[PDB]
Amino acid sequence: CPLMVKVLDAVRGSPAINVAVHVFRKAADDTWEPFASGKTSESGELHGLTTEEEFVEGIYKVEIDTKSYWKALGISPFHEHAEVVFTANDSGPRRYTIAALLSPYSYSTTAVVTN
Amino acid sequence: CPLMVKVLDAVRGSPAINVAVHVFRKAADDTWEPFASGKTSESGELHGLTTEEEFVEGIYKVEIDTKSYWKALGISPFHEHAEVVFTANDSGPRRYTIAALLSPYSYSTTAVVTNP
Amino acid sequence: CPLMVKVLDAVRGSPAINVAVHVFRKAADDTWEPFASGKTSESGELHGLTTEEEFVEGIYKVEIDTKSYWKALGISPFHEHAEVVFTANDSGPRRYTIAALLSPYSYSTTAVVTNP
Amino acid sequence: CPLMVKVLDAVRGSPAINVAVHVFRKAADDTWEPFASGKTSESGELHGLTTEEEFVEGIYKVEIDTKSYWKALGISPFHEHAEVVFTANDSGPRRYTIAALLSPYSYSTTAVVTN
Ligand SMILES: O=C(O)[C@H]1O[C@@H](Oc2cc(O)c3c(=O)c(-c4ccc(O)cc4)coc3c2)[C@H](O)[C@@H](O)[C@@H]1O
Numbered sequence: 433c434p435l436m437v438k439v440l441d442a443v444r445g446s447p448a449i450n451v452a453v454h455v456f457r458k459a460a461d462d463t464w465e466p467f468a469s470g471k472t473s474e475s476g477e478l479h480g481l482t483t484e485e486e487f488v489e490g491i492y493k494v495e496i497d498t499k500s501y502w503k504a505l506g507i508s509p510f511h512e513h514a515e516v517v518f519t520a521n522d523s524g525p526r527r528y529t530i531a532a533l534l535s536p537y538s539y540s541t542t543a544v545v546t547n
Numbered sequence: 548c549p550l551m552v553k554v555l556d557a558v559r560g561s562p563a564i565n566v567a568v569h570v571f572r573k574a575a576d577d578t579w580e581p582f583a584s585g586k587t588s589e590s591g592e593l594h595g596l597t598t599e600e601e602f603v604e605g606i607y608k609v610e611i612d613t614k615s616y617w618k619a620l621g622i623s624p625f626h627e628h629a630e631v632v633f634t635a636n637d638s639g640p641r642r643y644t645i646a647a648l649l650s651p652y653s654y655s656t657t658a659v660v661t662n663p
Numbered sequence: 664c665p666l667m668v669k670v671l672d673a674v675r676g677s678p679a680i681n682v683a684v685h686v687f688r689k690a691a692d693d694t695w696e697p698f699a700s701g702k703t704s705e706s707g708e709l710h711g712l713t714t715e716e717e718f719v720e721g722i723y724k725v726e727i728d729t730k731s732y733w734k735a736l737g738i739s740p741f742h743e744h745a746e747v748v749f750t751a752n753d754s755g756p757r758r759y760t761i762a763a764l765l766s767p768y769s770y771s772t773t774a775v776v777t778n779p
Numbered sequence: 780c781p782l783m784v785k786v787l788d789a790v791r792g793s794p795a796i797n798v799a800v801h802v803f804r805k806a807a808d809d810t811w812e813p814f815a816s817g818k819t820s821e822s823g824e825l826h827g828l829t830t831e832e833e834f835v836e837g838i839y840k841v842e843i844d845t846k847s848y849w850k851a852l853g854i855s856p857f858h859e860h861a862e863v864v865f866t867a868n869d870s871g872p873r874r875y876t877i878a879a880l881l882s883p884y885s886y887s888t889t890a891v892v893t894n
């Protein structure tokens with residue numbers, strides 16, 4: 433699994449479950465092409481997005497549909513979505529974990545890049 | 548000043564100075580139209596991006612050019628930029644502060660929204 | 664103003680108003696001696712805690728009473744308080760801003776340290 | 780495992796390995812009594828701190844020795860340590876994960892409380 437997404441809810445102190453996540457790759461003409469998507473599990477994780485073969489060097493965008501998540505909880509949030517944009521680079525370690533911590537008017541994201 | 552951006556550096560414990568910021572607005576055709584840009588000051592603040600008149604209802608994207616910041620400091624960071632996308636002024640005019648706290652492999656952004 | 668505290672609320676997108684803050688200094692006997700206290704303003708800021716003369720070198724603990732804040736708002740949060748423990752002024756006087764961003768089950772704190 | 784600690788490094792984008800963690804319980808006389816301790820693993824996690832039998836309701840303090848961590852990397856940090864103080868409560872879910880994200884002048888902590 434070269435790319436994993438983990439989402440946490442800072443209001444409830446829980447995984448953020450059933451959050452839609454869309455991954456895009458930047459194409460030559462500077463547009464964003466769909467690449468992978470899924471919904472977080474009961475543990476707030478989304479595995480199996482891509483394969484080592486498919487996940488080549490490039491710029492990627494991970495879009496997390498935070499607005500739907502909060503609205504389903506009856507909370508009006510600030511952001512349309514959370515967006516994580518990064519270059520995948522073969523130099524560094526093999527596995528990318530993109531973590532996000534959600535509040536209604538804030539989010540934090542960190543990358544854990546390991547072998 | 549209805550839109551302000553403040554950026555801190557979690558490695559140095561300082562304002563993040565000279566951080567480029569580009570703001571876009573979603574147009575009728577659903578493309579991102581350039582709206583305003585600037586750079587943070589010595590206090591890590593960026594004022595004067597827009598006016599109450601021009602900051603109409605819409606979906607805005609605040610791009611904070613974190614890679615250019617870390618690279619200008621000779622550090623290789625993870626993200627290309629921090630993106631903050633939100634609907635503004637859809638219940639009337641508000642004042643928005645977008646705050647961001649930067650590390651090379653992490654950032655945190657929050658909004659402070661007040662009613663004038 | 665050598666020690667200031669600023670607190671934001673990540674649920675409301677607002678300053679965190681009326682947050683109690685207690686500051687302690689580690690004494691010669693290694694106990695925490697009360698040093699200064701106050702409450703954040705309508706801007707989420709707390710000024711006037713101490714003076715340059717009284718803010719000598721030492722290990723300080725800034726306790727931000729987050730539970731009392733969330734409970735005063737009728738919310739049941741996770742933490743008792745946010746604690747920020749640091750050595751101050753050991754290379755000469757500095758100005759410290761302790762910022763904190765609060766959610767019911769999470770907080771983030773950063774320091775901005777400047778040289779007057 | 781009713782109490783797990785996970786520590787991440789926001790400068791390197793990695794688990795924070797070999798970080799000392801001390802857990803204390805608040806005793807009747809308002810002092811902090813040692814309760815459990817350990818060092819984070821290669822995955823930045825510290826398991827096996829306590830047992831369900833031992834982890835009763837009460838106020839606990841998790842002290843993470845961030846200062847030593849940064850100094851071992853040649854970085855001068857701000858905090859003496861990171862401190863997480865909370866009440867354990869039998870009402871809510873069973874398992875506490877205390878997560879911390881470390882930078883030299885900042886840290887963030889969130890609780891993930893699950894069944
Ligand atoms: O000029 C003003 O009137 C006020 O501006 C504030 O600037 C900031 C600036 C900030 O930049 C932050 C932050 O950045 C965060 C923060 C902390 C952790 C995170 O994970 C995310 C955000 C909290 O409070 C803040 C305050 C000053 O602290 C305050 O003294 C001053 O009077």
Ligand SMILES: O=C(O)[C@H]1O[C@@H](Oc2cc(O)c3c(=O)c(-c4ccc(O)cc4)coc3c2)[C@H](O)[C@@H](O)[C@@H]1O
Pocket residue numbers: 438440477529531532533540541542544655771785787822876878879880887888889891
């Ligand atoms: O089971 C899995 O497959 C994987 O679950 C993930 O667990 C977590 C769990 C977490 O709990 C966090 C966090 O909580 C923080 C965090 C803290 C404060 C912030 O402001 C932002 C992020 C970031 O990464 C994380 C990762 C890990 O990637 C991995 O150890 C585990 O095998």
